[model samples]
Target: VELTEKHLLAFEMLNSMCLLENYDHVLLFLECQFGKSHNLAVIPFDIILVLFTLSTLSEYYKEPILRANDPYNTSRETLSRRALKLLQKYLAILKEFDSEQYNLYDLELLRCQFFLAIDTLYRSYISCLEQRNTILGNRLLNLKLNEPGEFINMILWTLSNSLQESTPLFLSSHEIWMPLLEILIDLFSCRQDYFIQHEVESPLAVFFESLRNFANRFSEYVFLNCDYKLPSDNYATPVHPVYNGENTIVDTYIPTIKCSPLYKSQKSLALRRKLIGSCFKLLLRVPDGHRLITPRIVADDVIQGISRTLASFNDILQFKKFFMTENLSQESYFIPLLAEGTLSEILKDTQGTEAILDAKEQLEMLH
Candidate 1:
C-alpha cells in the first residue's frame, strides 16, 4: 500500500512526540488509529517507527528505577513485557518484508532502532531478574510463539545477516560494530547449557570465523589503534584544579571527562581486548575435537590474529595472567604463541609500529 500525505503527517507527528519523550501520547495515538484494525496494512516505515518509539521508551526505564528515590518495579515489569511483545511482533513483520533488501545505508535508522531495542531489552530483563548471573530466561528455553525467545532469535539472525553484507566503511563505524560486538560478547559469555537444551542456534562458528577473516585482512580490526597516539601527545592532558585567590574555588571534573582521540583509541584498545578475550573463553569451552580447535579450526587465522593481538599488548604478563587465572590459557592456539621461539616471530610484527610499544621491550617481556 502506498503511504499518503496523511500517513506521512501521522508518522512525523508521532516521531516528534517520541523525540520529546512523550511516549504515552505516541502510544495512545497508535492505539486509537491502528488499534483492532487487522485489515489495515503497515509499511516498513510504520514498523520501524513503532519499534523505535518502544526502544526509546525502554531506554529510559533504568534511570529512575535505579537512581531515583522510589523504584517502579511493578510498573517496569509490566511495561517491559509490553515493550518486548511489540518489539517481537514488529521485528517479525520487518523481517517478513525482506528488510535485508535495504542496506544499512537505506535503513540505518531501522537498524539502529533494532539494535537499541534488543540491547536495552536485555539490560532491562537483567534488571528485573532476581539473579544476574543467569543470563537466560525461561522464555528462551520454552521455545513457544510470541515470546522473547522469538525476539531474541530474530534479532540475532538479523544482526548476523547484516554482517554477511557488511561493507568496510560500514564495519569501520563504531556506532554499528561497537554495539554489535558488545551484543556478541554478551551472547558468547552466556552459559551454553541453557541454549543447548532447547537446541537454540549459536553464532559461534559463523561469527568467530568471520571475525578471524576480517582480522586477517585488516589487523586493526582486532588490534585497534596501532598508530601510537599517546596522552602526552595531546596538547590537553588532565590538569589538577588550580587554587584561585578567591576563597570560593569551583571544583569540576568536566575537562577530565571530555573525550579525545587519544582516549577514544585507548578505549577501543580495551574493547578489542575483551572481544578477543571472549573468543578465547569460547575456544576453551568447546570439546577437545571441535573443528575450531583443529589445525583446521579458526585454523591459521587464529594464529595470525592471536600473534598480532599479543604484540599489541603493552604488558604481556598482565594479559597472560588474565587468561591463566581465568583458566582460558588451556586452549592449544596459545601454546605455540607463548613459546620463546614465537617471540622472534612477533618481534618483526611488533617492530613495525610505535603506535603499540617499543618492540624490544614487548619481546623481552614475552621471552
Candidate 2:
C-alpha cells in the first residue's frame, strides 16, 4: 500500500494527542495499525509513533502516581522498571529496521525520533534525581554522556555551528529563542552539585558567548550599512534674512560650529558596548566547572569593554553640544527629546504605565 499524506497527518495528529488522558482510542488505533502488514514505505512513520509511545510512557512514569487519599501509591522502582522495559522493547525494534527497505526521503522523521528518545532519557534521569535514586540517575547520566543526541550537547553544537557562518540560522528564526530560554532556565534552577557530581558543563556559558558575538557583529553590520550625516560648519550662521536682522540675533558675531563624523561612530560603538555588557551580566550567574572559563574573566574584559563604550557614548551625548557652543559644560537639550522619543516610549510600552511613572520619578530625582 502507498503511504498517502493523509496517513502521515493522521499518524502525527494521533501521536501528538496521545499524551492527554482521553486519547486511549488513538493508542488503540495505532496498535491495530502496528499489527497489520503495512507497506515498508510507512516504516518511518511507524518508527516515530513507536518512539513517541515510549517517550510518553517515560513521561507518565515521572508524573506523581499518588493521590492524597489513595490507598495505593506506585513506587519509583515500579515506574522505572515499567518505563525501562517499554523503552528497551521499542529501541530494539527501531534497531531491527533496515534503512534500505523503507522510503528514506523523510530523514527528518528519524531525527525527530532520536530527539524524542533523548528527551525521554533525560526525563527519566530527572525522575531518578527527584526520588534520590542516585544510582539510577548516575547510570542515566553516564548513558547520556555517551549519547551524542543529548539535549545539552546538541544545543552547544547548534550554537557553535551557527557561529561559524556569517549569518546564523537563528537570526531569521526568532522562535528558537524560546527553547533556548527554557534550557537556560532549567539549567540554572538545578542544583550546582547535580552538575558538579555529573561532571557536566553548564550550557549557558556557550549560549551567552554566542549571543554576544551575534549582537556585536549585527550592530557593526547595521552601522556600516546605514547613512549618517556629519556635523558641518556651514550651519554656523543662519543664511536667511530673519537671522541677519537685529531682533533675532543676540550678537553680531556668528558662532563657529565644529563638524565631526566621530559622533555617529561613537553612537554605534556605544550600542555594541551595551549589548556586550548585558551578555556578561547573564554569564556571571552561571556556575563554573573545572574545565570551564571563569565568569570573572568573561565579565571583566569582555563585558566591561561594552560597558565603557556605553558610558563614553552617554558622555558624548551630554557634552558634545556644549563643546560646539560656548566650550563650557552644559547638558545637551536633545538628551530629553532623545530619551522620551526612543527609550521612554519603549519602556512605557514594555513595562506599562506604572513602570513609566516610576521611571519619571527616578529621572526627576536626578534633576
Candidate 3:
C-alpha cells in the first residue's frame, strides 16, 4: 500500500473529529497516537503528524477558548487548558530526542509549530486575564513549560540561525520571523505583569538581549543577496506610469531606483521595516534609565536598529519626528545614538537625493 493513502486516511480521521466539534475526542485521538510506547525519536513523519495535530488543535480552539461568555465556556476552557498541557508535554519529549534523529527541516518544523502553539495559548491566557477570568488565566499560567526560558532560547535560536553563515535557513521562511516579532511586540506591550510565571530572571532582560543581538546582526543580514531589481515590466519609470500596482508607489519611488541599493525587494524592505518598528515599540515600553536601557552599549545597538533603516528616507523622518515630538517622563535614552546613526547614513548621501535632503532637514531640526 502506498503511504499517501494512509496519510489521507489519517487526515480524514483527524479532520472529522475537529470539524464535528469533538474537541475532547481530538485530544483523546492525539494522546492515543503518542502513547507511552510510541517513539518519535526514529520516525520523522510521526513528528510531523504530532505538530500538524497540535496546530489543528491550536487553530480550531482559538475562537471558542478566547470568546467571553461562550455557550460551551466551561468545556472549551477545560479543553483549552488540556491542549496547553499537551503542548508542554510534547515539547519536553521532543527536547529529549537525539539531535541526529531528525534533519534540520523536521527540527525547524517542530520548533515553528510549537512556537505557534505557545503563541496561540498565550493569547488565550491574555484574553482571559483581561476579562478578569482568573481561574482560566491561572490555569494557563500553571500549564506553562517547566522552564519558561526555553521559549526564549527557542526564539533566539531561530533568529540566530537566520543570521548564520552558510545561508539563512530560518529567515528565508515565513513560518517564524513574522509571528515571532508580532508575539514579542504583544508581550512587551501587554498590561498584565505575569506571563512567564514561577522562578527565573527577568524574561524582558533575556528578551531585550535577544532584540539587541538581532539588531547587531541585522546590518550584516541585510547585506545578503536579499536585494534584487524589479522586472522590466515592473519597473518604476521616470514618467509616472499608468499601471502602478503598489499603493505607496509615490512615496517609495526614487529617481535613482536602479542605481540605489536602498530599493530592495519589497518583501525584504517590509521585513526590515518591521524589525525597526518592533525595536522602537519595545524600547518605548522600557522607561528611560530602566535597567534594560542602561550601559549605553545595549541601548546603542537597539537605537542603531531603530535608526539603521536609513535604508529609507521616510523612516529617517519618522524616527527623528518620534524623538523630537513624543513627550516622555524623561528624555529617550535612544535619541543621541539614534541621531549618530541616522546622521551617518544621511552624510553618506553623495548624490544629495531629495529624500536625503529631507532627512538632513529633519536632522538639523533635532538640534
Candidate 4:
C-alpha cells in the first residue's frame, strides 16, 4: 500500500492517544507502520512517531530494564551508550522548547526531560566508575554539572544569593526547602573533598549557612511552643534555685516546669550558638589549610559524626535517651543541627588565631 497523507495523520493520532492512555489499537497501528514493510515514503513519519513514543516512554513509563547487568561489564558498554544517546536527544528537544510558551502538561514534559537526562548521566558515570574508566567517568560527571536544569540552577542561585554578607535572602521558599536540603546533602555526599580544599567557589559553605539559619529558626519555633522536661540525675536535681549572694542554693522544687515564652524564642538562637561552637572545633582538626575548608575534607568528619549520633540514638542497647519526642513538624530539626555543628567546628579550627581574634572582636562589639 502507498503511504499517503492519511497514513501520516493516522500515525500522528495514534501517537497522541498513546501519550494519554495505552491502547491496544495504538500499539497495533505502530507495529503496522514500522513493521517489515520497509516503505521509504513513510520513513519521515515513522521517525516522528518513534520520537514521540520514546518521549512518552521516558516521561510516563517506569524505568525500562535497559541495562540491568553489572555496569562494569564490557558487554554492557554498548547498551549504556545507546541509552545515553536516546536520553540526550530527548533533552536536546526539550531544551529547544521555551517553557514559558508551554502549558502545565508541556512544562511537565520539560521537567521529565531534565530528570531523565540527569538520571541517565548519573548511571553512565557509575557504570564508567565500575569499569575503572576514570577518564570517562569524570567526563560524565562534568556533563551533569554543565547540563544544569532550570530548577537546579534556580536553587543554586538562591543558595549563592543567601550567603551574601548583606541583605541575605531568607528561606521564604518553604515548598522548595526539602528539595533544596536533599540537593545539598547529595552534593555533600558526592563531593566532600572539593569543599574541603577551601575553593573560592565552593557550594558547601552556602549549604552550611542555610542549615544554620534553618536550625536557628526551627529551634526557636519548637522551644517557644513546646515544654521540654529535663530528667533529674543523682548529682544534679531538676529544680529552679535562686542563688543568694552567699554560696547557698535556695531550692524551689517546681514539679511540672512550664517553659517561658522567652525560652521558646531563644531556642534557635541557642542551637545556632552551639552549632557554631562545634563547627569551630571540627575545623581546627584539619591539618592542611587548603584541605581544611574543602567539602570532601569536612564531609569525611561531618558524616562520621552524623552517622555516630544517629547510630547511637537508634541503638537498642543504649539505655541513654538521645533525642526528645517532638511533633511531626520538628522531624527535620536534627540533621540541620548536626550539619551546622560540623561546619562551625571546621571553620573555627582551620582559621586558628585570626579566627579566634575575630570571634573575640565580635563578642566585644556585641558587648
> Using lDDT as the measure, which candidate wins?
3
Window of ten residues with lowest summed lDDT in model 4: 240-249
Ranking by TM-score: 1, 3, 2, 4
Among these predictions, the greatest TM-score belongs to 1
Q: What lDDT score is found at residue 6 in candidate 1?
A: 42
lDDT of each: 0.37, 0.32, 0.38, 0.31
Task: Give the residue spans of candidate 1 off by over 4 A.
Answer: 1-180, 191-193, 196-201, 207-215, 218-220, 228-257, 290-296, 299-301, 309-367
User: How well does candidate 2 match the true structure in TM-score terms?
Assistant: 0.23
| lDDT value for model 3 | 0.38
Please give each candidate's TM-score. 0.34, 0.23, 0.33, 0.20
lDDT of 4 by residue, 102-179 (tens): 333443434433333233221111111232212211222323233534223333333322222221122111112222
Clashes of each: 1, 1, 0, 25
Which prediction has more favorable TM-score, 2 or 3?
Answer: 3
Query: Compared with the true structure, what per-residue lDDT tens digits does model 2 show for residues 227-332?
Result: 2221222321221111011112123323243324454334333332233333433444545643234322433243233222222232333223212323112223
The candidate 1 region of ten consecutive residues with least summed lDDT is 240-249
List RMSD in Å for every model shown.
Answer: 18.0, 25.3, 19.0, 23.4
